[PDB]
Design an enzyme around this catalytic site. Structure first.
Site, PDB file in Angstrom:
ATOM      1  N   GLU A  72       0.877  -0.992   0.002  1.00  0.00           N
ATOM      2  CA  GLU A  72       0.223  -0.014   0.140  1.00  0.00           C
ATOM      3  C   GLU A  72       0.756   1.261   0.060  1.00  0.00           C
ATOM      4  O   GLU A  72       0.320   2.141   0.586  1.00  0.00           O
ATOM      5  CB  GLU A  72      -0.956   0.104   1.219  1.00  0.00           C
ATOM      6  CG  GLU A  72      -1.899  -1.159   1.325  1.00  0.00           C
ATOM      7  CD  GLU A  72      -3.266  -1.069   1.898  1.00  0.00           C
ATOM      8  OE1 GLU A  72      -3.054  -0.322   3.090  1.00  0.00           O
ATOM      9  OE2 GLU A  72      -4.010  -1.507   1.634  1.00  0.00           O
ATOM     10  N   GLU A  90      -5.600  -8.467  -1.047  1.00  0.00           N
ATOM     11  CA  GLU A  90      -5.892  -8.359   0.334  1.00  0.00           C
ATOM     12  C   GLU A  90      -7.345  -7.804   0.175  1.00  0.00           C
ATOM     13  O   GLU A  90      -7.625  -6.735  -0.345  1.00  0.00           O
ATOM     14  CB  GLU A  90      -5.108  -7.035   1.051  1.00  0.00           C
ATOM     15  CG  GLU A  90      -5.126  -7.249   2.687  1.00  0.00           C
ATOM     16  CD  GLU A  90      -4.351  -6.331   3.449  1.00  0.00           C
ATOM     17  OE1 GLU A  90      -2.927  -6.365   2.977  1.00  0.00           O
ATOM     18  OE2 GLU A  90      -4.921  -5.371   4.161  1.00  0.00           O
TER      19      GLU A  90
HETATM   20  O1  DGJ Z   1      -7.790  -2.876   7.003  1.00  0.00           O
HETATM   21  C1  DGJ Z   1      -6.611  -2.959   7.647  1.00  0.00           C
HETATM   22  C2  DGJ Z   1      -5.463  -3.710   6.902  1.00  0.00           C
HETATM   23  N1  DGJ Z   1      -5.422  -3.670   5.430  1.00  0.00           N
HETATM   24  C3  DGJ Z   1      -4.421  -2.691   5.226  1.00  0.00           C
HETATM   25  C4  DGJ Z   1      -3.002  -3.178   5.569  1.00  0.00           C
HETATM   26  O2  DGJ Z   1      -2.380  -3.792   4.415  1.00  0.00           O
HETATM   27  C5  DGJ Z   1      -3.265  -4.265   6.638  1.00  0.00           C
HETATM   28  O3  DGJ Z   1      -1.832  -4.460   7.408  1.00  0.00           O
HETATM   29  C6  DGJ Z   1      -4.300  -3.853   7.425  1.00  0.00           C
HETATM   30  O4  DGJ Z   1      -3.891  -2.434   8.354  1.00  0.00           O
END
Ligand code: DGJ
Ligand SMILES: *[C@@H]1O[C@H](CO)[C@@H](O[C@@H]2O[C@H](CO)[C@@H](O)[C@H](O)[C@H]2NC(C)=O)[C@H](O)[C@H]1NC(C)=O
Ligand SMILES: *[C@@H]1O[C@H](CO)[C@@H](O[C@@H]2O[C@H](CO)[C@@H](O)[C@H](O)[C@H]2NC(C)=O)[C@H](O)[C@H]1NC(C)=O
Ligand SMILES: *[C@@H]1O[C@H](CO)[C@@H](O[C@@H]2O[C@H](CO)[C@@H](O)[C@H](O)[C@H]2NC(C)=O)[C@H](O)[C@H]1NC(C)=O
Ligand code: NAG
Ligand code: CA
Length: 640
Positions: A158, A234
């Site tokens: 991210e 994810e």
């Molecule tokens: O929804 C939160 C979740 N998605 C975002 C991140 O990649 C994860 O580590 C976690 O913080």
């Protein structure tokens, strides 16, 4: 009405598998010290084929010593010239998964990086070869020390990608004989990675999979144009009640139907972190009490089963998938060997809400579905049936449905919030172990002398680092303190989250109000060094900078402080103290109602200092900055 399921005109996309994420951050923290047989049983529910979730894919964080949502995870290279492939628990988890399922798919992705990689800046793209060197060592180490083949490698979770980095990563992988490792990018949004692949031929060649996060079951046009495999790398991240299970059920189907995504990976694998940490109980199941052995096989476990137990990576989707006229959806898959799996979901809006995104209301009502098997599917005299009802009956097998008619057709009455799996496969099984012990709070009296010479894991149990990294440490010359717990970071990581300026590890029961915390501390840095112990610490993880409570600091310049916050903005008390570096002291902190006291080597330093009340939270230990310090003989007595 009728829904045609056909083979004759071809197939859809290759199915890549269903998986889950261990990490981002420290999500599997409390699993490692589960007693047997419970720990082994939990792992079966997750990874054992034809039993529980039967996951095809395990994705893990490559720890970078930074805070990454519910804690920090240890890197294999804390400092330059340091290499250790036995820290943390992701190695162990991957080995446990591979033992249960040798065909499982393994992925690695960095959230944070050690500070020394940035060479002065908090940026992993300053030296591309160095960062790629770091990442590739992790992959080499998995093979050399654990016999693990990593299947996919990501970029920076991210966070922005660098096209030159990805190319360098590919070149480095090939150079180390890892041609078989595939690259997935960029674990963020569909853009700018999708358009970058269309504009750049050399980038297109080195990226194997486009993985996007929380896509809401849709993709974008440039991604389709790329011709690359598209994954929801994810998703989920919802509390594992029936609602979260409904969310998980709906997107498993509709990620492919609506977005051509041939894989979906949930965050997270199992909720083995304190519930009062961010996104508590947002795993496929729950295992957050190693002291009692209690674990909850939540609804999402069986939602997964409806797909995983009857599909494998390498199957193909049929061209004939879609939505149901009165709400819900259906997918169909084959192995090209005459086997056929059909997965039907009718999740209502109110019982399938995900946190990201939140769908505008859609209607769902009673309906009839007629399916007709055309093409080579025209055959198949029998189909096994599996059923789930959320809101509550789970993964129960129904009577075989027969198609001896010759019409190759059958009909179902569907209702809100239901899953049906129709498969030719006969290996389905609702795995079962006897119920685990009942829920019990964290032990009101607890101690750890850290006296383990050959520890299985690099850190003492139940200590969840929220900034910095704490490890078992053996000092052979000292006799009284030969085995201690040591914070080992000496500089701030290239952070993913907003790590605290001070290191900290929390432990215990967040409900604790009145408590007494004791620990032996040791400051390694002359003049400037400092350490603390604390109670009523109410926040951690992504919000660790927000942590309030009662913090008892001592410093090597001969002073102490009592603060209401981890950031030390709010003073409860302060003064001088007989404290220097490289000396062992015993700190005691007692908190009851409106008042707290502190002891140094059993002698009162401060007493009846007014603190805010009511208030509750964990106990903790830490250091003033990213600095070496040791801890020993930890004890806590508390009232919940
Ligand atoms: O929804 C939160 C979740 N998605 C975002 C991140 O990649 C994860 O580590 C976690 O913080
Ligand atoms: C991705 O999936 C979509 C389905 O949402 C495909 O788009 C069309 O979908 C409609 C109905 O949803 C079908 O009638 C069309 O036949 C589909 N298009 C084609 C060309 O068949 C889309 O094709 C898929 N993209 C792929 C597989 O690359
Ligand atoms: C559906 O089930 C499995 C899919 O893997 C197939 O069973 C295997 O078939 C191969 C050769 O086709 C054998 O070598 C294996 O020993 C079989 N394993 C088992 C457990 O039976 C099966 O052929 C597929 N097709 C049908 C019609 O059942
Ligand atoms: C924590 O300590 C506080 C303060 O001693 C307790 O609050 C007291 O509770 C008693 C009842 O047993 C009352 O008579 C007092 O007036 C309360 N004092 C204050 C300041 O509120 C509290 O009950 C304790 N909590 C636990 C869980 O032990
Ligand atoms: C949903 O659909 C049912 C069945 O057609 C209908 O009876 C009901 O009024 C609808 N409600 C909403 C809010 O759309
Ligand atoms: Ca000790």
């Amino acid at each position: 009405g009728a829904y045609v399921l056909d083979d004759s005109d071809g197939l859809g996309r290759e199915f890549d598998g269903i998986g889950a994420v261990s990490g981002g951050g420290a999500t599997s923290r409390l699993l490692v010290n589960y007693p047997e047989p419970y720990r082994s049983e939990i792992l079966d529910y997750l990874f054992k084929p034809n039993f529980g979730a039967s996951l095809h894919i395990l994705k893990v964080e490559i720890g970078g010593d930074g805070q990454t949502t519910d804690g920090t995870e240890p890197s294999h290279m804390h400092y330059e010239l340091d290499e250790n492939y036995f820290r943390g628990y992701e190695w162990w988890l991957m080995k446990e998964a591979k033992k249960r399922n040798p065909d499982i798919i393994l992925m690695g992705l960095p959230w944070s990086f050690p500070g020394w990689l940035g060479k002065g800046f908090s940026w992993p793209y300053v030296n591309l070869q160095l960062t790629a060197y770091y990442v590739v060592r992790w992959i080499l180490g998995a093979k050399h020390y654990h016999d693990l083949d990593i299947d996919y490698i990501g970029i920076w979770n991210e966070r922005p990608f660098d096209a030159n980095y990805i190319k360098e990563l590919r070149k480095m992988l090939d150079y180390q004989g890892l041609q078989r490792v595939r690259i997935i990018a960029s674990d963020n949004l569909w853009e700018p990675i999708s358009s970058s692949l269309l504009l750049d031929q050399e980038l297109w060649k080195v990226v194997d999979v486009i993985g996007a996060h929380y896509p809401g079951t849709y993709t974008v046009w440039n991604a389709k144009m790329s011709g690359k495999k598209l994954w929801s790398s994810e998703d989920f991240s919802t509390i594992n009640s029936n609602v979260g299970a409904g969310c998980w059920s709906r997107i498993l189907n509709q990620n492919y139907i609506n977005g051509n995504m041939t894989s979906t990976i949930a965050w997270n694998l199992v909720a083995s972190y304190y519930e009062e940490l961010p996104y508590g109980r947002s795993g496929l199941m729950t295992a957050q009490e190693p002291w009692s052995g209690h674990y909850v096989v939540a609804s999402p476990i069986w939602v997964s089963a409806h797909t995983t137990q009857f599909t494998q990576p390498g199957w193909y989707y049929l061209k004939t998938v879609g939505h149901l006229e009165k709400g819900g959806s259906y997918v169909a898959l084959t192995d090209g060997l005459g086997n056929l799996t059909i997965i039907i979901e009718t999740m209502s809006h109110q019982h399938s809400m995900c946190i990201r995104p939140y769908l505008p209301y859609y209607n769902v009502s009673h309906q009839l579905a007629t399916f007709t098997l055309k093409g080579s599917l025209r055959e198949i005299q029998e189909l096994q049936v599996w059923y789930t009802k959320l809101g509550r009956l789970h993964f129960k097998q129904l009577d075989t449905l027969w198609l001896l008619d010759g019409s190759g057709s059958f009909t179902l009455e569907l209702e809100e919030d239901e899953i049906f799996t129709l498969t030719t496969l006969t290996t389905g099984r609702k795995g079962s172990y006897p119920p685990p012990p009942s829920s019990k709070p964290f032990p009101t009296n607890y101690k750890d002398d850290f006296n383990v010479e050959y520890p299985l894991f690099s850190e003492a149990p139940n200590f969840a680092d929220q900034t910095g990294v704490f490890e078992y440490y053996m000092n052979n010359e000292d006799r009284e303190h030969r085995f201690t717990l040591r914070q080992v970071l000496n500089q701030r990581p290239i952070t993913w989250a907003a790590d605290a300026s001070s290191t900290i590890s929390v432990i215990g029961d967040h409900h604790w109000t009145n408590m007494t915390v004791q620990c032996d501390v040791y400051i390694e840095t002359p003049r400037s060094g400092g350490v603390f112990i604390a109670g009523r610490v109410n926040k951690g993880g992504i919000l660790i900078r927000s942590a309030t409570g009662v913090f008892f600091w001592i410093f090597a310049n001969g002073s102490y402080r009592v603060t209401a916050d981890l950031g030390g903005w709010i003073t409860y008390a302060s003064g001088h103290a007989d404290v220097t570096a490289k000396r062992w002291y015993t700190l005691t902190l007692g908190i009851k109602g409106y008042f707290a006291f502190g002891m140094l080597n059993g002698t009162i330093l401060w007493k009846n200092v007014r603190v805010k009340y009511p208030g509750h939270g964990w106990a903790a230990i830490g250091t003033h900055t990213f600095e070496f310090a040791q801890f020993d003989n930890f004890r806590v007595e508390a009232a919940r």
